[PDB]
Amino acid sequence: ILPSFIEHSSFGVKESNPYNKLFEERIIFLGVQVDDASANDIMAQLLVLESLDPDRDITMYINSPGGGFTSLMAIYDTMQYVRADIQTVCLGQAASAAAVLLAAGTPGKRMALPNARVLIHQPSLSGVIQGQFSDLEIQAAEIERMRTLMETTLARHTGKDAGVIRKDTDRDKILTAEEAKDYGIIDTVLEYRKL
């Protein structure tokens, strides 16, 4: 259950949802696994914030397990397409696909919270796909292309060489906020504004 609050001005009264208030501030929230559903929604949101004020930065809050490759590149291209700069903020984790999206923010505007973590690994297939060797040869070929493509994308954003990424992503690599900063995934770590 998510409570809705109420705002009022000389022009009228407005009852709104917390997530609507975030979007009013140009904040897109990715809180779920990346899939065809989630990807389409984020792309729609990005293109809208593009339409309203193309000159103003867009903010992406990321807490995600990660997700599909096609869905990731759908979001990724849209992020890079939009004229507005894109700020990425990581809350509590960004894993697999989500780590790439976190790093895909425009340089200098990528950040994370102190106790957040970042997971990077090569693409994996949990289930089993069957068929003639000719078919698997094609699937395996594509899978390697997608692997290298994730490595290439991470490489230019982090600044690391594709070979280094390939070596580090062979096994799951968990990074703290500071460790992700050093790796080149995020530029800065948000500090508590409290006393």
């Binding site: 501030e25 903010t59 505007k109």
Partner: peptide, 6 residues
């Protein structure tokens, strides 16, 4: 998260 995001 402003400053600066937003």
């Amino acid at each position: 998260f402003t400053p600066x995001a937003p």
